[PDB]
C-alpha cells in the first residue's frame, strides 16, 4: 500500500484498500472509511467494478440526460467520487470551508456554497437527482468568479472548475465533442 493519503498526500492514520494499493485518511475518503468490512475496497475500486460489470456504461452520454438521473446507489457513488476528485487537488482548500465576504467594491453571493457543505449534503442523501449535486458544485466556482471580479484570485475558481468539469465528463462518460 501507499504510505501517503491519496487525497491530501500526507501521512498519518491511514486505512488501506484491500483491492488496490491506495490509502486514505478516514475523512479524506468519501464516503468516510467504513468501521469494519474485511476486505475493504476504496471508491476507486468500486467505480472500476461498475464499469467492468457494464462495459457499455462507458459509451457517450448527453449531459442533459445525466443530470436528470435519480440518485440511485450507482449515481450517488459516482457523485461521491467526483467530489473526491476535486478534494484531490490542493487548490480545493480555498473552497472547502464556509466562506465570508467583505471586500471593497463587491457584495457576497446570495447563496454561498462550499465543498464541505456539498459533502454533508451527499452524506445526508439530500440530492434526489444528479442535477442537484452538479448545480451546487458549479455554484461554488460561479460565486467565486463574481465576488473576486478583476482580482487575479478569480483564476483559482477557473482552475478548480476545470478539474471538476474534466472529471465530470470522465466519470459520467459524457460524449466527446469539439
Q: Interface residues with Zn ion (CB under 5 A)?
A: 5, 7-8, 17, 20, 25, 28, 42, 44-45, 54
Minimal distance in Å, beta carbon 4 to Zn ion?
Answer: 8
Q: Is the peptide bond between 39 and the residue preceding it cis, with omega within 30 degrees of 0?
A: yes
Q: 8 or 96, CB closer to Zn ion?
A: 8
Minimal distance in Å, beta carbon 56 to Zn ion?
Answer: 5
Record the cell numbers describing residue 31, joined without a space. Answer: 464516503
Q: 7 or 66, CB closer to Zn ion?
A: 7
Q: 5 or 113, CB closer to Zn ion?
A: 5
Record the cell numbers describing residue 121, joined without a space. Answer: 449534503
Residues 27-48, buried b or exposed e (16+ Cβ, 10 A)? ebbbeebeeeeeebebbbebbe
Cβ pair 28, 8 in contact under 8 A: yes
Q: How far is CA 88 from the centre of its chain?
A: 9
Q: 87 or 147, CB closer to Zn ion?
A: 87
Minimal distance in Å, beta carbon 17 to Zn ion?
Answer: 3
Minimal distance in Å, beta carbon 6 to Zn ion?
Answer: 7
Amino acid at each position: 500500500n501507499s504510505n501517503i493519503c491519496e487525497v491530501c498526500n500526507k501521512w498519518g492514520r491511514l486505512f488501506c484498500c484491500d483491492t488496490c494499493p491506495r490509502s486514505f485518511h478516514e475523512h479524506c475518503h468519501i464516503p468516510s472509511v467504513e468501521a469494519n468490512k474485511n476486505p475493504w475496497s476504496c471508491i476507486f475500486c468500486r467505480i472500476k467494478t461498475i464499469q467492468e460489470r457494464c462495459p457499455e456504461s462507458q459509451s457517450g452520454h448527453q449531459e442533459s440526460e445525466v443530470l436528470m438521473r435519480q440518485m440511485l446507489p450507482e449515481e450517488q457513488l459516482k457523485c461521491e467520487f467526483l467530489l473526491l476528485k476535486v478534494y484531490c487537488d490542493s487548490k480545493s482548500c480555498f473552497f472547502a470551508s464556509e466562506p465570508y465576504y467583505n471586500r471593497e467594491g463587491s457584495q457576497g453571493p446570495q447563496k454561498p456554497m462550499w465543498l464541505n457543505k456539498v459533502k454533508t449534503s451527499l452524506n445526508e442523501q439530500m440530492y434526489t437527482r444528479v442535477e442537484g449535486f452538479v448545480q451546487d458544485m458549479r455554484l461554488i466556482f460561479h460565486n467565486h468568479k463574481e465576488f473576486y471580479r478583476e482580482d487575479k484570485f478569480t483564476r483559482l475558481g477557473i482552475q478548480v472548475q476545470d478539474i471538476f468539469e474534466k472529471n465530470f465528463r470522465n466519470i459520467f462518460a459524457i460524449q466527446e465533442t469539439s
